[PDB]
Structure 1
Amino acid sequence: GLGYGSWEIDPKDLTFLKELGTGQFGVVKYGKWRGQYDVAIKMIKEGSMSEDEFIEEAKVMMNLSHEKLVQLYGVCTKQRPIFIITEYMANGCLLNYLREMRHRFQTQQLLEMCKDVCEAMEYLESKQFLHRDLAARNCLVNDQGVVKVSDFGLSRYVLDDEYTSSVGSKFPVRWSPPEVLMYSKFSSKSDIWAFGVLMWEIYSLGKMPYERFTNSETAEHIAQGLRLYRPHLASEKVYTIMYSCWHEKADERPTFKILLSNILDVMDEE
């Protein structure tokens, strides 16, 4: 209506139904838009986010639509705190989902989770959009068990310096290639590295990568050319795919298109 751009949701159209959890920017709630449509409502804690830069980028993120990307519906801008309105994912965080041993996953289900994420990332790569923080903690699971990539590019708007620089206490060291840790070289190939680590998280049922090491020890390990090794649930062919993501030379890592082809080959063979 009158006072609203295409990227802007009237918060008066929201019904709040359940508290889901709290993350980086604060509380997430389940609700309805205009009485009918399931939404997630992220209440952005004051001072957590570069809000004007985020809102400008929200316009670009609105046009990123792929069935394996958590859809951005819009933002509630006129207020404190602002709200980010997204596709509701009833089964929550992929990391928590993997750690629930009751699911008793088949390796075919784990490969489907890798394929879901890989389709999302191939789409983002096709639009020259980097995720910049790909990990199981940034994937969500819907009521049908479909995995979707969430919070793509949002790390750019985090004001907490512990999260944003390589030797920050909250930087994702364990998902980062050597060139990111050594001189902050972000590229398509740092998303590829992260995707390899996400495949390892899935096949490890949500173990922490390098779980016996500190961030400092992890950085030294990977800089010296040492790597994660094969999760017990990963076949030789699955391990070959995740390992291909960790070539010391970034230009020798595959694309998301090549990874998707390799994952579809294994699905057919295994």
Structure 2
Amino acid sequence: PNQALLRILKETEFKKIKVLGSGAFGTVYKGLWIPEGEKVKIPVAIKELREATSPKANKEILDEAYVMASVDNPHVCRLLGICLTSTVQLIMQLMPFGCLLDYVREHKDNIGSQYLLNWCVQIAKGMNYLEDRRLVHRDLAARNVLVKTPQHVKITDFGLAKLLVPIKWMALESILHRIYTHQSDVWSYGVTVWELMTFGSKPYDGIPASEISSILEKGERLPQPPICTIDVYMIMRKCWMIDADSRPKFRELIIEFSKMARDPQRYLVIQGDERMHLPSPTDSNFYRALMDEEDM
């Protein structure tokens, strides 16, 4: 961990503007960074954790924050900065589009097959990269994929296991034994893709979280999303095998979905898939030069 990658912030160089949402461990705000000696106001996203901290407690956090500021992959968000006060604040890039879960709801049945497949590929590439860095996500879900542009999504909020519940995204072995590996991350990938293919349906909606390990024992799984051809649905089911080692690997999921992305209409069936927009190269260039210059 090159410690120059994590910028330590004083309270005086940023301000919280507005609340974006909250989750298990914190609250996310629209923020503004003020570089010292300048008059510019730079938008940032700030997460403040619910529970306070001591310098001994902070030593564990800094040690991990250094690891998450060291990721370097186009499909993985990296921690940028931190402010250690009574409560801890974490700073990353603010994404105006927000998370992919809200984006598929906002455009429900208004999203073509080229986009959904492209996203699956991209989430897989980012998860594979974390695996190569030997980082377990532990909380992969559509709410933790961020839309940088409609053509470019990024994984966020990974790596919290060595500092510590999303039952309906969790593998059977994680529910029963708090076992988190990359293969249980592969389970949450399967659930994430099911979210995309349903435009943000809630998984196991009538079924309380208390009962989830029973129904997975019984062999029940999430139903096949209407737009999914069988080939796509069995990748999802392969991700939900009892035997973690029988699940697909993230390198395999990249090859597979990127093969389906080459003829998207063969693998998903969307009504008026020709009503749908598709990523114009003119549109893609404009988005990249304006808000997405990173190297890919």
Q: TM-score range by the shorter chain?
A: 0.7 to 0.9
1:137 aligns with 2:143: yes
Q: TM (normalized to structure 1)?
A: 0.85
Instruction: Say whether the 8 Å CA contact 2:5–2:80 is kept in structure 1.
Output: no
Larger radius of gyration: 2
Aligned to 1:57: 64
Instruction: Say whether the 8 Å CA contact 1:89–1:140 is kept in structure 2.
Output: yes
CA distance in 2, matches of 1:33, 1:60: 25
What is the deviation of 1:16?
4.6
Structure 2 residue identity aligned to 1:181? I
Aligned pair partner of 1:40 in 37, 41, 45: 45
Bigger drift between 13-22 and 256-265 goes to 13-22
Q: Alpha carbons of 1:33 and 1:263: their partners in 2 closer, same or farther (altered >3 Å)?
A: farther
The answer for unaligned runs of 5 or more in structure 1 is 159-170
Q: Secondary structure at the match of 1:142?
A: strand
Aligned to 2:182: 188
CA distance in 2, matches of 1:232, 1:39: 38
Summarize the alignment of residues 85-164 of structure 1 with structure 2, pairs less than 5 Å apart: 85-101=91-107, 104-154=110-160, 156-157=162-163
Residues 151-188 of structure 1 deviation map (CA, whole Å, 9 limit, x = unaligned): 10135545xxxxxxxxxxxx211112222222222211
* Residues matched between the structures, number: 254
1:217 aligns with 2:211: yes
CA distance in 1, matches of 2:117, 2:78: 23
Aligned to 2:258: 264
Q: Secondary structure at the match of 1:75?
A: strand
Q: Alpha carbons of 1:17 and 1:180: their partners in 2 closer, same or farther (altered >3 Å)?
A: closer
Instruction: Say whether the 8 Å CA contact 1:94–1:147 is kept in structure 2.
Output: yes
Instruction: Say whether the 8 Å CA contact 2:13–2:34 is kept in structure 1.
Output: yes
Bigger drift between 140-149 and 40-49 goes to 40-49
Q: What is the root-mean-square deviation of aligned Cα atoms in Å?
A: 2.4
Instruction: Say whether the 8 Å CA contact 1:16–1:29 is kept in structure 2.
Output: yes
Give the percent of matched residue pairs that are identical in Structure 1 and Structure 2. 33
Structure 1 residue identity aligned to 2:248? P
Aligned to 2:26: 25
What is the deviation of 1:269?
3.2
Q: TM (normalized to structure 2)?
A: 0.78
CA distance in 2, matches of 1:40, 1:155: 22
Aligned pair partner of 1:246 in 229, 233, 240: 240
Bigger drift between 60-69 and 25-34 goes to 25-34
Residues 80-120 of structure 1 deviation map (CA, whole Å, 9 limit, x = unaligned): 33220102111112222222146711122111221221111
The answer for unaligned runs of 5 or more in structure 2 is 265-296
Aligned pair partner of 1:175 in 169, 175, 178: 169
Q: Secondary structure at the match of 1:92?
A: coil
Instruction: Say whether the 8 Å CA contact 1:91–1:145 is kept in structure 2.
Output: no
Aligned to 2:279: none
